[PDB]
Design a protein around this nucleic acid. Structure first.
Ligand SMILES: [Mg+2]
Ligand SMILES: [Mg+2]
Ligand SMILES: [Mg+2]
Ligand SMILES: [Mg+2]
Ligand SMILES: [Mg+2]
Ligand SMILES: [Mg+2]
Ligand SMILES: [Mg+2]
Ligand SMILES: [Mg+2]
Ligand SMILES: [Mg+2]
Ligand SMILES: [Mg+2]
Ligand SMILES: [Mg+2]
Ligand SMILES: [Mg+2]
Ligand SMILES: [Mg+2]
Ligand SMILES: [Mg+2]
Ligand SMILES: [Mg+2]
Ligand SMILES: [Mg+2]
Lengths: 201, 252, 139, 109, 190, 175
RNA sequence: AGCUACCAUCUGUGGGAUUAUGACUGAACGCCUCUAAGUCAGAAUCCCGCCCAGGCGGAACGAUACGGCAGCGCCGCGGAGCCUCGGUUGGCCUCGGAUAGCCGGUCCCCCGCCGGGGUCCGGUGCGGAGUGCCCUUCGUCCUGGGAAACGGGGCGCGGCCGGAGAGGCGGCCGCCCCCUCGCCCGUCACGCACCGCACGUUCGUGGGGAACCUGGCGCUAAACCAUUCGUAGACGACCUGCU
RNA sequence: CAUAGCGACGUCGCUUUUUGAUCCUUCGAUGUCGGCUCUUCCUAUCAUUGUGAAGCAGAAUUCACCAAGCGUUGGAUUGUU
RNA sequence: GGAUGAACCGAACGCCGGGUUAAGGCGCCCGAUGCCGACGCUCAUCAGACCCCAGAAAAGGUGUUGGUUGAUAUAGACAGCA
């Protein structure tokens, strides 16, 4: 689409969400993934940590400063996964990669906006309930990410402010329902039209 | 094939960018962890290496050969004229690290401190902070400064003070003072901001920062030796005298 | 925790497949995945049907398992499932979806006008209620 | 007064893995995510509208920067609402991931 | 094979009540309150009557491994009932050949100091889990009493005490010194 | 032999008449096959194994599909078969619940492929029989012999995961 | 003097998840069981800290060019235009989340007149529904009925509040100036009706660069070379000094 | 006392630090042994850390696990490995 | 097509447009399953993942799933406790 697609990374499987995001950005769409510390990986935490430690072991023997750059933030981990699914060594792939933004937590541009969900990448429907999974935030923290605590604190503050906003919205909606109850003699003429054509059961 | 005999590696790989330091002062890079329980205090100071001598003292180490005995010990003298506090920096914690939130500078910044801001002090018009210091007098600038202090109080996690050395008290040629952010530890952000604001434009002597017989860390840039070979730089084994193209080399 | 159960006589709504949008009664259970299924009054002849395309309702019929079409149809007709289903909120939501989908361009225009006026009146009343509630002043 | 055309994305050319047939293009029409929904758009005119440096004549208007490569949808592609399009000239590769307008012009309804 | 239904029912005594918040069981009895969630197991918990307080655990369409969890949940709930009604008391004995093991119980029974284990100068400080109180028995000369409401916490504290006094670099079949859990029972014996 | 939804075929064949017996005996088999061509091929395979017959030396006088005589009734099927594993041949007795005999045999082929990696060319179905519910031996089949059978559908996974592909609401699994 | 030597002297560090292993509770398998679900301890290993470097990576702050016509910044969407780069063709201004469960509303208890609990009442193939919601563009003129009339508009002024994770945003008051129009259903006619035809329709007063005019409000600086220093040094670079 | 520690007769492997077998690359040339120097890697662990077992009383030793972080030396003879 | 490859699998070739296939494929790279695909099996602290082909055996497992044969049991089995 023409606007930015904001995806909440909580409860989403890494590779599934990354494949969807890669196709979206290749189709010329701006995608912003927030709360990348909430991304889940199937398989138990020790196995996933072993996978990332093997990735850490892969370095250039002659000069590690040139070698593979092992990014420790969950946002950068997800970004590298999407880059793995993109043709990043061509101009088209680099433009597609530039169309993607990743964040830990939800920063101020996007904490006041609705966030989409990709059901085809959700753990609840893609994973059996008996299986074990790992949290990307915990994996990143125990492999070297330094900002798990401050991100948690800022997320708690954001959740408090969102709770206040939601209480205000519920009060407004209650008042709207009361208003619809108050005026119905002057409303039933259009309510019947809406009910006839299927809007507003 | 494996090397015939085992030998430990020459030099440490923990200092590999064996390059000229990009700085001359020596930055802290890690301040002591802050706990609000302690009283408000500064965490660092700036001195100048004057020279070395030696002292005689009696040791109070039980179970040692030198218990209750006299020893001669080499000591280093570091001249430490009092620092002058000229500013306050606030930092805020972000998922990308600490970032500078707001810097507030005191009125009446010293001449030697202002010399730090100029590459050519001789040709300068000495205009630094001249318009900034005017906001400490008018009501608009004073309100802006109070808003900055309140924002630091309610948003910043760690604050630091800008302090500069006093060149005029040293026997050195250099008149350009050294500036430094020194972290304030030991209290709430409001308390340390109040403490720093009272210490603005003031002199902090070294005895208020450090005490007798405590162990501290010294940060600085070592003596330059210029361009050196492997034998002097990494202390590798010298090759035998019969070597053709040179013996102060690493063979393989 | 669970309130709707797969059992004999349970009425299920068909979500997809060749019989989508119809009501059926569960006559028997086969191998954890399929059911012998019969809609005698909703025009679904007896056949096997997977549980994945079923959505259980709150109606349960009382007939023995693997009874014939006669008894299933009498159980359906007595305490008529069709009228009760049509009265439920589920079926009228389905009907609302259908009549919204089959709405023409002129109908869309008329709905736009009616919804415009309705929303404006409701918004005026909401503003009035907000201003009425704002006059709170009590120590 | 209104958009009057369906949005589509130039996804790419008809291709194998290692061969590319640039004479026909693959279009992703927005909101069309099944093959059975593509029947409406078959035969519809489609346009790649872009801007350039020099002014060109505009039919029924003053010259401006706008240029068009005209085309039309030929058949459905895949199972997921892709369509194939033939344009008068093969689409430039810089247009991949950019807007194509499906114009509704040859209406069958 | 998927079993259609595997259920098991636990009876609740009259003096104790149980509240379900989803899969979180809160058991309130005379001795306290034990709260434990079983959200890692996909079962259905139901309270049956207003008369005798049966709690039924149901598993639908479970294979063998998750049929194994129904009796685990039921035994955990029975242990919670037992803890809030009678409590759990573990009696440990300190055995030694030459060096007596001196045990000092610090504040409120929450810390245990072992002094002379195998005659070494090291002092073992073992901190009990919260809600577990340690004491020195007045009936036996070398006996620790660990009392609490949560069986896992009490037994974990006992295991910490037992594992602190571990003989190393010696034949453990000969150097039998240490503190060992002698018996497990209840308080109030009711 | 591949598969699909198998069908039952009654296949009747005989030898060609020779100046040793003018009326050779007729032999009948039940063949579960995708189609009548495969049914005739399997008939020749089996009668070649059992009797001393060949496709060239004999003929097939009938090959007709056997329709299920009660496809509206759930029933229990016992299937005796033999198959070649990777290291031997084994006889198996399996049980299934289905409406049709051919569907039960198809279930058997899929289940053998799933549980024993047995391809359809390794499997010889030697007997299929409808059995009473009291004669069943497999608990997975016997557990459905309940006149008051009752179970929910606990964790209903969303299957329309791409319509819509992007949404604001997270799916519900409880119904 | 400088350089320099275990050939003199000084200094060398903290956590986390865990491996092996030993255990707890506990089924499977009315017993047992370190394991299946759930837990504990756990190391020269591993990761991080301390330490070294510091991204075609950011932040805060300072000063920002004349004594003569000479440059610059902000305010005006102020005017008239050029050159170049093109994309796009309404918006959604946010609970936390669970999934073997959820969502909404309401009376009694506790805590600042709002929230958190216990009731009770509803909804749940989500209808207080993103399979959704909002806005909705032909424009005017006579002209009536309904909605409102405690109402909308100000690139109109001044004030206040909230927002710091990248606040680059949002909201509320006081004064003034307007129309009674704009929203629905009707009456009444008109507009280039350009004679079948494409790139139409928006964001948009778009981004960027030089330059002309028009006013107001404000500013008068550094860097580099050269010189010097020697805490530095192959040369660069670096530390310095200069009414 | 088979299996603490060993393992006959048999039998299944792994490795490319031995020596063979072959002759695919190199004969308009890839400088051919050893030592010295220096870096890194492997583990099939000698020591050190944490453990399990013994025909483990202690001491010493032996077997095994996680484990390559760190170390594994000075010399006489010999060109030697 | 097999990522890659003289020999494998498909198929042999003038320059093109349209249609359809082979072998092989259809999460993303990368065309195509964005089917409300079917039935099961499997959890790996070295999982597995497609001719040639690019790594493994004997021997084990009270992991789990099927199957064969035999045995005991209300004349009360089995397991626990005595
Ligand atoms: Mg070695
Ligand atoms: Mg020589
Ligand atoms: Mg010993
Ligand atoms: Mg030395
Ligand atoms: Mg027990
Ligand atoms: Mg363990
Ligand atoms: Mg632990
Ligand atoms: Mg013997
Ligand atoms: Mg050469
Ligand atoms: Mg060479
Ligand atoms: Mg090893
Ligand atoms: Mg090829
Ligand atoms: Mg290959
Ligand atoms: Mg062709
Ligand atoms: Mg492929
Ligand atoms: Mg594709």
């Amino acid at each position: 689409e023409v606007q930015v697609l904001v995806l909440d990374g909580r409860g989403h499987l890494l590779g599934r969400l990354a494949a969807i995001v890669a196709k979206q950005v290749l189709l010329g769409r701006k995608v912003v993934v927030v709360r990348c510390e909430g991304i889940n990986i199937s398989g138990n935490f020790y196995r996933n940590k072993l996978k990332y430690l093997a990735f850490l072991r892969k370095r250039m023997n002659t000069n590690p400063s040139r070698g593979p750059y092992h990014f420790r933030a969950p946002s950068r981990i997800f970004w590298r996964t999407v880059r793995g699914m993109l043709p990043h060594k061509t101009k088209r792939g680099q433009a597609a990669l530039d169309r993607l933004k990743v964040f830990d937590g939800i920063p101020p541009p996007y904490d006041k906006k609705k966030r989409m969900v990709v059901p085809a990448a959700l753990k609840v429907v893609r994973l059996k309930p008996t299986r074990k999974f790992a949290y990307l935030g915990r994996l990143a923290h125990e492999v070297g990410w330094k900002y798990q605590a401050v991100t948690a604190t800022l997320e708690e503050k954001r959740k408090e402010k969102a709770k206040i906003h939601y209480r205000k919205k519920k009060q407004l909606m209650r008042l709207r329902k009361q208003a619809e109850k108050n005026v119905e003699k002057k409303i039933d003429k259009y309510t019947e039209v809406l009910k006839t054509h299927g809007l507003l059961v | 094939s494996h090397r015939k005999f085992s030998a430990p590696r020459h030099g440490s790989l923990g200092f590999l960018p064996r390059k000229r330091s990009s700085r001359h002062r020596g930055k802290v890079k890690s301040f002591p962890k802050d706990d609000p329980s302690k009283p408000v205090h500064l965490t660092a100071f700036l001195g100048y290496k004057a020279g070395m001598t030696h002292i005689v003292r009696e040791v109070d180490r039980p179970g040692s050969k030198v218990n209750k005995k006299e020893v001669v010990e080499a000591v280093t003298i570091v001249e430490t004229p009092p620092m002058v506090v000229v500013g306050i920096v606030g930092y805020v914690e972000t998922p990308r690290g600490l970032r500078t939130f707001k810097t507030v500078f005191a009125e009446h910044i010293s001449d030697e401190c202002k010399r730090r801001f100029y590459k050519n002090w001789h040709k300068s018009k000495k205009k630094a902070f001249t318009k900034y210091c005017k906001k400490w007098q008018d009501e608009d600038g004073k309100k802006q400064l109070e808003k900055d202090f309140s924002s630091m109080k309610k948003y910043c996690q760690v604050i630091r003070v800008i302090a500069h050395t006093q060149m005029r008290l040293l026997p050195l040629r250099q008149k350009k003072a050294h500036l430094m952010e020194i972290q304030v530890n030991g209290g709430t952000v409001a308390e340390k901001l109040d403490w720093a604001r009272e210490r603005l434009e003031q002199q902090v002597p070294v005895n208020q920062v450090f005490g007798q017989d405590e162990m501290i860390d010294v940060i600085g840039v070592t003596k330059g030796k210029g361009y050196k070979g492997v034998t002097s730089r990494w202390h590798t084994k010298k090759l035998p005298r019969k070597t053709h193209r040179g013996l102060r080399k690493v063979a393989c | 925790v669970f309130r709707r159960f797969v059992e004999v006589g349970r009425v299920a709504y068909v979500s997809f497949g060749p019989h989508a949008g119809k009501l059926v009664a569960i006559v028997d259970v086969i191998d954890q995945n399929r059911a012998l299924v019969d809609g005698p009054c909703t025009q679904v002849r007896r056949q096997a049907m997977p549980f994945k395309c079923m959505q259980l309702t709150d109606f349960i019929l009382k007939f023995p398992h693997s009874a014939h079409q006669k008894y299933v149809r009498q159980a359906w007709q007595k305490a008529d499932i069709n009228t009760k289903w049509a009265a439920t909120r589920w079926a009228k939501k389905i009907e609302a979806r259908e009549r919204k989908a089959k709405m023409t361009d002129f109908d869309r225009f008329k709905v736009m006008k009616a919804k415009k006026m309705r929303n404006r009146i409701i918004k005026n009343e909401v503003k009035k209620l907000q201003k009425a509630a704002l006059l709170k002043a009590s120590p | 007064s209104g958009r009057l055309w369906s949005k589509a994305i130039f996804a790419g050319y008809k291709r194998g893995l290692r061969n590319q047939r640039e004479h026909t293009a693959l279009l992703k029409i927005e909101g069309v995510y099944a093959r059975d929904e593509t029947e409406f758009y078959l035969g519809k005119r489609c346009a790649y509208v872009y801007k350039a440096k020099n002014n060109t004549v505009t039919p029924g208007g003053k010259p401006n920067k706008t240029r068009v490569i005209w085309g039309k949808v030929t058949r459905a592609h895949g199972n997921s609402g892709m369509v194939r399009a033939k344009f008068r000239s093969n689409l430039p590769a810089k247009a991949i991931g950019h807007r194509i307008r499906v114009m509704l012009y040859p209406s069958r309804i | 094979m998927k079993t259609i239904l595997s259920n098991q029912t636990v009876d609740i005594p009259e003096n104790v009540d149980i509240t379900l918040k989803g899969r979180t069981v809160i058991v309130k009895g005379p001795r306290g309150t034990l709260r434990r969630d079983f959200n890692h197991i996909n079962v259905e918990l139901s309270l049956l009557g207003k008369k005798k307080k049966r709690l039924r655990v149901d598993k639908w369409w479970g294979n063998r491994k998750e049929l194994a969890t129904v009796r685990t949940i039921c035994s955990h709930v029975q242990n919670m009932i037992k803890g809030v009604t009678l409590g759990f008391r573990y009696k440990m004995r300190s055995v030694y050949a030459h060096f007596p093991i001196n045990v000092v119980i610090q504040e409120n029974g929450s810390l245990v100091e072992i002094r002379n284990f195998l005659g070494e100068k090291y002092i073992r400080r073992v901190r009990m889990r919260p809600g577990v109180a340690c004491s020195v028995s007045q009936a036996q000369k070398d006996e620790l009493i660990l009392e609490g409401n949560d069986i896992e916490l009490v037994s974990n504290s006992a295991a910490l005490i037992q594992q602190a006094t571990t003989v190393k670099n010696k034949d453990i079949r000969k150097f039998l010194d240490g503190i060992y859990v002698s018996e497990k029972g209840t308080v109030q014996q009711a | 032999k591949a598969s699909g939804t198998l069908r039952e075929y009654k296949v009747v064949g005989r030898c060609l008449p020779t100046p040793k017996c003018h009326t050779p005996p007729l032999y009948r088999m039940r063949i579960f096959a995708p189609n009548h061509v495969v049914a005739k091929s399997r008939f020749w395979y089996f009668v070649s194994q059992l009797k001393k017959m060949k496709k060239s030396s004999g003929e097939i006088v009938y090959c007709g599909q056997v329709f299920e005589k009660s496809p509206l009734r759930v029933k229990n099927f016992g299937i005796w078969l033999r198959y070649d594993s990777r290291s031997g041949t084994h006889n198996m007795y399996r049980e299934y619940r289905d409406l049709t005999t051919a569907g039960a045999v198809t279930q058997c082929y899929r289940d053998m492929g799933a549980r024993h990696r047995a391809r359809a060319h390794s499997i010889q179905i030697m007997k299929v029989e409808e059995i009473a519910a009291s004669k069943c031996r497999r608990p997975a089949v016997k557990q459905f012999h309940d006149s008051k059978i009752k179970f929910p559908l606990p964790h209903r996974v969303l299957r329309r995961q791409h319509k819509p592909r992007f949404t604001t609401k997270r799916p519900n699994t409880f119904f």
